[PDB]
């Protein structure tokens, strides 16, 4: 079904510098002659972008993997239609569902399904003497299709059946983002011919599609099309048939951009915010022409590098268990009080109990109770029926809260309660606990 | 990609809890949203109060944490007639332990063995090394404290993006050149609409220079750019020669 064909040749890496490209509309609204400043996940104007070259025309075969890292600014130029699509997947097997984006002449298919890929997946086309036509029946990229999740079919885009000879290279420049379960593919089709693949002329991108799919992909692959060629026996050459390609990949860093909208709604140009101090002045005045003078742009501060904390090494524990392991509790009319001081005591152990019916706290949220520390810790205890446990709280009334034990309105602490009918009840009733019912 | 008649939620009137957040409960059907997220699960009745913003405990801390900026409804009702099994139902599970509290709306599915104690057990259950999942065990005899409660959480999304979900409303013609607020498949138009041009790239929907001059009537069948302007508000003054001179 599938044949494994690996290679030993590896190409060296290279890098270059982006100049101006990478500006897209950050919203679906229309603004004319406006200098709106938008904060978004853009890319810096002067950035380093990785440059890769595909199969070199004796022949060199390679297939690299590039990190995604919160979107990718992609640029490429091809004319032989060698690039058919991409496959995305952390493992690219039946363990997890895999994404396959394929563009062909008939249509474009985006399949999110579990596909069993090989070590070196590839796609091939051939020609039939009897059919007098070409077809693609070499589905060696995947072996089995199970656990189908998503299938999307769209009409082909950004492909023109134009036949010309000369330096008619066409530039394709996309931006990939994946946020909040939404995949956004911005693009700009601008045919520009120039010796260097990365031009200088400014351009503004537009949204193309939006896929409402949430998936995290770390490693991907870009496939290729192999055309079968009939050679004479004297040639004795076979095994690989493909073309050549190259592309640029850059990353996006979130920051603020002051963007100039043309009267037609397009973008004439834009200026970064943190590129240079002049750009900071240009952004802080929302203008492009700054007259001579001194402008206050922002503030600068020195950031701390480490945190310092110290406490005595004795760390003697205080009897938080004394007011919790106590066998007998005083009645509410004579509530017992226990002072806690000169100690260290965590409060996550109360969580480890998880046996409390009500752990409601006031003044200080107990998510990080142990973070701070206090002048004095007071432990009070009593026993009441679960009817009025709710009224032992700041600003509460009732006979229990008005005649026996009343919290202050500015109270700051936790209230802890549980059910213990096991330890303080007996057949015929337990009459040890008495509560005050009347008072002036 | 559909209209949502939320009035049927009140029509059933069989829901124990319906209290909503960040949007009017009764007149919910009168607006439109960028997207409608429907989350569904089943939990214990005594813990349904935990599915709410700013709530802490077991479920809201360890399985399904609702964000503070949540704008949507929360729904619950009894399920004994459909989810009670004699001898206890053990199909349902709820996570008991976590390394840390989940981020809002997160979805934790991993079944890695939890290390409750100080002795590492290299992902093998044993003493104080527990399987994080655990069954509810719905006894049909059990009272309202331990009943199986089905919960549906609707998470809306309000933005300026194309609203795919919308209320029923009605259908009638369109008028312009006279200031009037109305609706046309999700429009407000508090002002006078003119047959402007405002050449705009065929992907945008709204439009404003400072506050609002939106256009592009939201009808999928017909699109047209309609400027939005006020209808000549103005102060009024009075000239009087003097009450003791004339009238």
């Amino acid at each position: 079904q599938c044949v494994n064909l690996t290679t030993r040749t590896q190409l060296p890496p290279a890098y270059t510098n982006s100049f101006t490209r990478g500006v897209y509309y950050p919203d679906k609204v229309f603004r004319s002659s406006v200098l709106h400043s938008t904060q978004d996940l853009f890319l810096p104007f002067f950035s380093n972008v990785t440059w890769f070259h595909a199969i070199h025309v004796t022949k060199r075969f390679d297939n690299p993997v590039l990190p995604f890292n919160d979107g990718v600014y992609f640029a490429s130029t091809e004319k032989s239609n060698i690039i058919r699509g991409w496959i995305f997947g952390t493992t690219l097997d039946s363990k997890t569902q895999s994404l396959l984006i394929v563009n062909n002449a008939t249509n474009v298919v985006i399949k999110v399904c579990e596909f069993q890929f090989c070590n070196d997946p590839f796609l091939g086309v051939y020609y039939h003497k009897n059919n007098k036509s070409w077809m693609e029946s070499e589905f060696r990229v995947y072996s089995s299709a199970n656990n189908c999740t998503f299938e999307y079919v769209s009409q082909p885009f950004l492909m023109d059946l134009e036949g010309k000879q000369g330096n008619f290279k066409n530039l394709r420049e996309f931006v990939f983002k994946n946020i909040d379960g939404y995949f956004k593919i911005y693009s700009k089709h601008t045919p520009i011919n120039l010796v260097r693949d990365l031009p200088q002329g400014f351009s503004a991108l537009e949204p193309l599609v939006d896929l409402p799919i949430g998936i995290n992909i770390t490693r991907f692959q870009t496939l290729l099309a192999l055309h079968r060629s009939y050679l004479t026996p004297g040639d004795s050459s076979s095994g690989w048939t493909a073309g050549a390609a190259a592309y640029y990949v850059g990353y996006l860093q979130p920051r603020t951009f002051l963007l100039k909208y043309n009267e037609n709604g397009t973008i004439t140009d834009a200026v970064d915010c943190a590129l240079d101090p002049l750009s900071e002045t240009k952004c802080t005045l929302k203008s492009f022409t700054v007259e001579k003078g001194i402008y206050q742009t922002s503030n600068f501060r020195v950031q701390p590098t480490e945190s310092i904390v110290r406490f005595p090494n004795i760390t003697n524990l205080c009897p938080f268990g004394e007011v919790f392991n106590a066998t007998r509790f005083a009645s509410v009319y004579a509530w017992n009080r226990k002072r806690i001081s000169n100690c260290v005591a965590d409060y996550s152990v109360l969580y480890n109990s998880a046996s409390f019916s009500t752990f409601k706290c006031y003044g200080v949220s107990p998510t990080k109770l142990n973070d701070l520390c206090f002048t004095n810790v007071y432990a009070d205890s009593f026993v009441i029926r679960g009817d009025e446990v709710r009224q032992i709280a700041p600003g509460q009334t009732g006979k229990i809260a008005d005649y026996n034990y009343k919290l202050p309105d500015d109270f700051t602490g936790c209230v802890i309660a549980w059910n213990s009918n096991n330890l303080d009840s007996k057949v015929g009733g337990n009459y040890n606990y008495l509560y005050r019912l009347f008072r002036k | 990609n559909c209209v949502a008649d939320y009035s049927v939620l009140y029509n059933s009137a069989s829901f124990s809890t319906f209290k909503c957040y960040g949007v009017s409960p009764t007149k919910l059907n009168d607006l439109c949203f960028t997207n409608v997220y429907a989350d569904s699960f089943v939990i214990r009745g005594d813990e349904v109060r935990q599915i709410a913003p700013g709530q802490t405990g077991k479920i809201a801390d360890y399985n399904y944490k609702l964000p503070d900026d949540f704008t949507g409804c929360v729904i619950a009702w009894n399920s004994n007639n459909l989810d009670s099994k004699v001898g206890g139902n053990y199909n349902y599970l709820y996570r008991l332990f976590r390394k840390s509290n989940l981020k809002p709306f997160e979805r934790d599915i991993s079944t890695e063995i939890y290390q409750a104690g100080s002795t590492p057990c290299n992902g093998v259950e044993g003493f104080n090394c527990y399987f994080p999942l655990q069954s509810y065990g719905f006894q049909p005899t059990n009272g309202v404290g331990y009943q199986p409660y089905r919960v549906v959480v609707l998470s809306f999304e309000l933005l300026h993006a194309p609203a795919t979900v919308c209320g029923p409303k009605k259908s009638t013609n369109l008028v312009k050149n006279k200031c009037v607020n109305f609706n046309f498949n999700g429009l407000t138009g508090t002002g006078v609409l003119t047959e402007s041009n405002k050449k705009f790239l065929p992907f945008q929907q709204f439009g404003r220079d400072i506050a609002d001059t939106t256009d592009a009537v939201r009808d999928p069948q017909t699109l047209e750019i309609l400027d939005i302007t006020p209808c000549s508000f103005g102060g009024v003054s009075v000239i009087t020669p003097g009450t003791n001179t004339s009238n």
Epitope: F320, G321, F324, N325, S348, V349, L350, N352, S353, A354, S355 | L96, A116, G117, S118, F127, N128, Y130, F131, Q134, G137
Partner: nanobody
């Protein structure tokens, strides 16, 4: 001295049943879970069963999967263990051990149980 009361240990025929109980009091009023271990003559200590004190989660060893039932009553503050299909190898001494938040597993004196016909 943390005292755990172990009851039910005694002689039992092969393929029988038993109900062992470990009762406790104290432990800073709050723990994380309770457990049962066993030690056979000529053999070291080994894990048998465990139940968390907060939830009903149960952990069983491979050699006792599906034939024991370990529960606990928080109100009674006592752990109960139900034994069925007593194999001859089960002859050992069983300990009830209480691990607490950052605390060892309270190791009682243990009780001897012998499987013989």
């Amino acid at each position: 001295e943390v005292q755990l009361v172990e009851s039910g240990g005694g002689l039992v025929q092969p393929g029988g049943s038993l109900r062992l109980s470990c009762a406790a009091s104290g432990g800073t009023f709050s723990s994380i879970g309770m457990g049962w271990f066993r030690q056979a003559p000529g053999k070291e200590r080994e894990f048998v069963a465990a139940i968390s004190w907060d939830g009903g989660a149960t952990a069983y060893a491979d050699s006792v999967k599906g034939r024991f039932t370990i529960s606990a009553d928080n109100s009674k503050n006592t752990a109960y263990l139900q034994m069925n299909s007593l194999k001859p190898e089960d002859t050992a001494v069983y300990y009830c051990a209480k691990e607490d938040v950052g605390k060892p597993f309270d190791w009682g004196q243990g009780t001897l149980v012998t499987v013989s016909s």
